[PDB]
Symmetry: C3
Subunit: 346 residues, 3 copies
């Protein structure tokens, strides 16, 4: 029915216990041919309660992690040392494939909600995580090496090894903290569109190094109840829109001619293909996050509103031949709307 | 039978009316595995009678347009203004995805014949065009937005909108002109091969910016009745050869060993895979256009003729062991032909 | 059963005669979904007896050739001249697609063993070779051109042509020498890991131009009977490991959790996916060659041994929560092994 809509019920549970959970969105091109260009990306969601730890592991994919709610302490381990980063809501950072890391929710009363965008390359569309410790689910990967191999490697009898490293200590991979380059924020720059109905912050590869290698753009959208983000479309970027807070009424048009409309609730996701005109209304105060792939050189073209409206650049004789009304009639209509980008949805 | 030949009857009609037409070549890998490397490209042809207009629309693909015959006025619309370019025969220009544009045939007695090479990325192998105006075939895309959405966007009652913008004015997307970076030419530089039998002009990514991002080379070939373009092959570039004027006898060799030969008439197309030796004879005076994909660093290696013949660089003892005749016998034979590139097909 | 193991019996014979042979490894993703990232590469092996010649031909693929044993004289022919390179064991060179070339084994008592890594782009996963001379198997490609075409091209009656060029002289493409940028070596730099149990030499794209365009890393591994290359994994590079001399016991771990182990004999090949931990023991003195694809920025992370061990960078409280033993117990165990990279397999 509507191939660009991914409701939260379409995420799959990798792990869940009383301290948090890890879910993975179904493959973008799982049951549609329309999203072939997104086959190398996977979206994950990590949520954990206070004073919890996600145990050390490395992923086989490059990850872009965004703190959607809360605060976290992220530790990146290298062969020669380690890097510790304190993440705030709205903070983003790229964890390269193969870097072991663990995450901590240090807050005493706030939950951690993190969005992980995965860019796969080893096996297109597949993300694997290698955890160092054994648990109910799965034994430590170190455990699959032969005794001989292990004994020689560490230079200790198998005994010391299976007791100090391989034995199952914890139950899951999210555990309770024993009861005793750099990240960037999506709001570190003025918004690009900002008025009394809405605000849009956006970081593009041309301005940020970590995004430059991924060819990804990131954006933070906030709108007031009843406001409307007017019909527009992206020239190059296909955008994965994530509903963070609030409810949104989204209308997407694509090519015979189809209208895909839906109301997104927190957790829901809608993918906006490059070139498709789209518009959305804040059915309530809302915040959304957007990840745009194929981002280099994207341009947003507006179809309504005063500023950046392409329809307003079409000359009169052309517009006369283009639309029903006369040149003067169309040019006036396009003037009625005084506001740009975000308008009143009343 | 012959997988690299696309006869004009294999183009498909998108739109046609008394003022012109738009056709799209079938997918290169439609019924052959052999052209997987061309799956992201589509070739289109636009032809229109005098004093006609192709209505404003944006495409979801990057387009390379070539004026094959006539003259045109192309207008590129941006959110802040517009650019107008007057195109002559042999003129080429790249229209980036998402840029709305319209085309005019200003001539009073000459037809417009334009070749559009499409480089897809949103949905590999698919080109979509979004037209602003409604017509018999399809309503304006603006029309698929809800009234509410439209009313708020423009700030006008739905009434003014459906009359000034969405109502069906024109019948098709090619209409009669009311009865009242920059483009480059394929001949802007001396030809690379030029003698009394033929001439070859060629623009490569290493010399032109717009071609640099597409990794495409373009070439214009003209030969005299009876002349022969001697056996040679391209090291990296796979070339789509388009028969513009005249008739051509083409012989293509590929690997068990196969000879694909055919006579191309105006409109016909033959694809020359990198490495395959190829040769062709002008059954009459002729002009052809070539679009080479995977162009960076292409090298043409000649198998006959005096200049740039690889066979003439093989040393004598090797050639002796390589061919039947003696070293001296082969080296002489290779001398018989005094001319290079283009020779006499008598 | 074990999808990453390619035993020498899986190579296929292209050509074989009393003077040598040419074999081609089956497609990496032939019967496994797991190696999609390797579908564009093919591995070939060329072996020839003394004073032999492999006849001139061009390939439609870029080739990386490595001299595994012996010495060779390689001649690269261009349209304007020729380049001759003398290759020694351990020498590597890239032959671009479309460059005709021939190879000679000048030694009087030593065989030539060359590994050819093919990077395809015309038809992903397919390598074609165009030989200039006709033989039992296949006629010269020049022979598929029409007489007319040939006569005009060379300017000689068909007679002189079919006798001097097209007639079948030799029997195969490897013949006996009539009884009368630049290549680089894998050891041109100090090894990166070097002790009394093993040595590892490695050339990465960041340090070598020819490798830079292929995004390939190359490495030469030599280990003493009984030594062990400790558990470690590659962050980005998927590595094709080729068993040159000796026997190796390899243990590879991948993700439910699987242990793929095997002993490699000379000629055998094992593919190590990025991120999978791997370890191997020299069942006898041994030399192996590795070709790593997706090489840019690869990092090797060690799981045992003193130097570059990631497990040793995990802080104590974390390790306590991560592993069974206490922080102190794990940190000590990880100290038992005094040596790094290569240890004793006794």
């Amino acid at each position: 029915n509507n191939p660009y809509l991914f409701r939260s019920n379409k995420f799959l549970t990798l792990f869940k216990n009383q301290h948090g959970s890890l879910r993975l969105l179904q493959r973008f091109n799982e049951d549609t041919e329309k999203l072939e260009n997104l086959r190398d990306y996977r979206v994950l969601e990590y949520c954990s309660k206070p004073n919890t730890l996600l145990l050390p592991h490395h992923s086989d994919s490059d990850l872009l992690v965004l703190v959607l709610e809360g605060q976290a302490i992220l530790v990146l381990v290298n062969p020669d040392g380690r890097d510790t980063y304190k993440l705030d809501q709205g903070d983003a950072i790229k964890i390269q494939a193969g870097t072991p890391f663990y995450l901590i929710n240090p807050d005493n009363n706030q939950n951690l909600r993190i969005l992980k965008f995965a860019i796969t390359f080893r096996r297109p569309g597949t993300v694997e995580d290698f955890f160092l410790s054994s648990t109910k689910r799965l034994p430590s990967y170190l455990s699959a090496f032969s005794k001989n191999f292990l004994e020689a490697s560490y230079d200790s009898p198998y005994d010391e090894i299976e007791q100090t490293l391989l034995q199952e200590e914890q139950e899951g991979v999210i555990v309770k903290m024993p009861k005793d380059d750099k990240p960037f924020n999506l709001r570190s720059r003025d918004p690009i569109y900002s008025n009394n109905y809405g605000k849009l912050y956006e970081i593009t590869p041309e301005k940020n190094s970590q995004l430059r290698d991924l060819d990804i753009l990131l954006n933070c959208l906030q709108m007031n109840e009843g406001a409307l983000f007017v019909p527009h479309y992206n020239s190059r970027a296909t955008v994965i829109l994530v509903a963070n807070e609030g409810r949104a009424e989204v209308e997407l048009v694509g090519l015979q001619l189809r209208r895909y409309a839906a109301t997104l609730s927190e957790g829901d996701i809608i993918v906006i293909p490059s070139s498709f005109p789209v518009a959305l209304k804040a059915a309530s105060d809302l915040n959304m996050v957007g990840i745009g792939v194929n981002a280099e050189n994207n341009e947003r073209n507006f179809l309504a509103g005063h500023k950046e409206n392409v329809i307003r650049q079409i000359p009169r004789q052309v517009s006369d031949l283009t639309f029903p009304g006369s040149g003067e009639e169309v040019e006036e209509l396009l003037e009625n709307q005084k506001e740009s980008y975000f308008v009143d949805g009343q």
